[PDB]
Paper text:
To understand how different sequence specificities are achieved within the CCGG-family of restriction endonucleases, we have focused on structural and functional characterization of the BsaWI restriction endonuclease from the thermophilic bacterium Bacillus stearothermophilus W1718. BsaWI recognizes a hexanucleotide 5′-W/CCGGW-3 sequence that accommodates W (A and T) nucleotides outside the CCGG core but rejects S (G and C) nucleotides. The BsaWI protein is folded into two domains: the N-terminal helical domain composed of α helices H1-H3 (residues 1–69; termed N-domain) and the C-terminal catalytic domain (residues 70–272; termed C-domain). We show that in solution BsaWI protein exists in a dimer-tetramer-oligomer equilibrium, but in the presence of specific DNA forms a tetramer bound to two target sites.
The asymmetric unit contains one protein and one DNA chain; a dimer can be generated by rotating protein–DNA chains by the crystallographic two-fold axis. BsaWI forms a stable dimer by swapping the N-domains, while the C-domains are located apart of each other. In the crystal BsaWI forms a dimer in an ‘open’ configuration that approaches the DNA molecule from the minor groove side and makes no sequence specific contacts to DNA bases in the major groove; therefore we term this complex a pre-specific complex. Direct and water-mediated contacts to seven backbone phosphates of each DNA strand are made by eleven residues from each subunit, mostly from the N-domain and from the H4 helix. Two residues of each BsaWI subunit interact with the symmetry related CC:GG half-sites of the recognition sequence. Additionally, K85 contacts the N3 atom of the outer adenine A5 of the same half-site. In the structure of the pre-specific complex these residues are disordered, however the position of the modeled backbone atoms corresponds to the R-(D/E)R residues of NgoMIV in the superimposed structures suggesting that in the specific complex they would make similar contacts to the recognition sequence. Despite the presence of Ca2+ ions in the crystallization buffer there is no electron density that could be interpreted as Ca2+ ion in the vicinity of the active site of BsaWI. In the crystal structure, the BsaWI primary dimers form a linear chain of protein molecules via C-domain contacts. We hypothesize that in the crystal BsaWI primary dimer is an ‘open’ configuration because the crystal contacts at the C-domain interfere with the C-terminal domain closure and transition to the ‘closed’ form observed in EcoRII-C, Ecl18kI, PspGI and BsoBI DNA complexes.
Numbering used by the authors:
A (entry chain A), B (entry chain A): 1 to 272
The structure:
DNA sequence: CTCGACCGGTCGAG
DNA sequence: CTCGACCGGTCGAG
């Protein structure tokens, strides 16, 4: 028996024995991992411990997926990690392309974070230095996916910060705090969401709109969701035309330019 | 053609056309993702945008893995995420079990973070309140995987903080700063590593041992690696018996108990 | 090459 | 049920 065969067979034995006896899969698989690693390092002292750990991984992956072929596994993980890093960029780019075709006629455009970074470096952004510094900090910490600007007196101003998520699933507990900081800094702060399934839970409606003990204030000025459900306070429906986002951006730009002192969290579109 | 067939065929077409023309796979796959999402939302207005995005995912995963079967993909990801969350726990538990069989005869034991959390809550840890508070902060932020204690005058003291990683690959740029804070707090701060391949790079030797412009000070008191390479300053070899870790723990406990003021980053085992 | 950031099913303990 | 933390090949721009 070579070390790899030994690990495969030993992990399976210890898992099965432990699971029949204690009836807890998570405890049993950890025991199988730990005890197979220890046993194999004893039975095979001259094999690198990292290689043994990889054989244990193989055994655990086979049990939990039914797939023993390390090439299949590698290929799926490679593809998944490709999607994980590129798809969010593709979706931001999509929003920018869709939004800019509509916003252009009102003097506005959406920028990627790297667009805004280059424009700040080329001194193309007219905001006050205090804003520029704050935006540079948001860019540094990768807080917002997109930014939106408005042209006024031949100068371009960033007035809004945008989170654009392909899953509204979970990221929103950690996305709310920086959105509230953007509202505190007197920027329009909004989110664009692909899937509204998470808003099934009352918790997530409360995270956006506020008004409960856990979530006293709204977390955004507006949340734009790709669905056909009617508006719930600051949770608005959009489709490929981004209509309410574009019409609210018009109003936000106006108020940011002319009455910015009232652009804290209380600001809401369509109230005038 | 239903929307799913449309997405599969359209992603493939746009990718291939764009890749032959511009010769950049990452640009081309993002264009295929963006333009297939837009095209499909137009061709299929009554399909939920999230479902379209899932069909685009399917197409991208098929191109990059060769696997079209969504069940295979789901099963591999499920298994991978199981390994990702449980294997690190199994390895910590393994170190605790291995270490404690040896350390017991010298009045020492290794605790999991959750062990130390329970013992602090049950007032079983004799450290000064200043230490207790600091440890509670480290537990809160999940900084260390394991802790080590020593019994003195019938009281148990935490004297060391331990990082225990199954890949020394990357985590170490982010693990160094909290280890240096533990040394600043006058605890023994060490790391136990499964795979030393990353120490091929001079950068990572420097991260542990210090003495360069990028890394002026050592990042740990000691790094214990499962390999047979001879000691490089504070990078020590171990196998399943953890020998140098156990012998250095003896010395660390002694010095923490009796001359703790000199247990900053400069402390090193075996120098007396 | 370097190197920081990305994700989401699962784990774990409520 | 809730809910915060885990990872590592890839992306992206050096
Ligand atoms: Ca309100
Ligand atoms: Ca419509
Ligand atoms: Ca030194
Ligand atoms: Ca040995």
């Amino acid at each position: 028996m070579n070390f790899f065969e030994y690990c495969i067979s030993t992990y399976a034995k210890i898992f099965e024995e432990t699971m029949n006896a204690v009836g807890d899969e998570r405890v049993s698989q950890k025991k199988a991992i730990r005890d197979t690693m220890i046993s194999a390092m004893r039975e095979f002292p001259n094999v690198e411990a990292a290689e043994i750990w990889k054989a244990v991984y193989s055994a655990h992956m086979d049990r939990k997926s039914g797939i023993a072929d390390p090439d299949i596994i590698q290929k799926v993980i490679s593809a998944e990690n490709s999607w994980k890093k590129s798809s969010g960029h593709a979706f931001e780019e999509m929003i920018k392309l869709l939004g800019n075709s509509s916003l252009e006629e009102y003097g506005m455009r959406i920028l990627l974070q790297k667009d805004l970074n280059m424009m700040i470096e080329n001194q193309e952004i007219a905001n006050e230095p205090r804003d520029i510094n704050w935006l540079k900090e948001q860019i540094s910490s990768n807080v917002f996916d997109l930014y939106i600007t408005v042209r006024n007196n031949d100068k371009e101003y960033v007035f809004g910060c945008i989170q654009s998520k392909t899953s509204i699933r979970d990221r929103v507990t950690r996305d709310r705090e920086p959105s509230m900081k953007a509202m505190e800094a007197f920027f329009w702060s909004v989110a664009i969401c692909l899937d509204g399934d998470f808003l099934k839970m009352p918790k997530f409606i409360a995270m956006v709109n506020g008004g409960t003990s856990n979530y006293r204030l709204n977390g955004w000025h507006g949340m734009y969701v790709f669905w056909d459900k009617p508006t719930i306070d600051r949770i608005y429906p959009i489709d490929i035309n981004l209509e309410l986002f574009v019409q609210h951006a018009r109003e936000a730009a106006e108020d940011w330019l002319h009455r910015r002192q009232w652009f804290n969290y209380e600001w809401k579109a369509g109230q005038k």
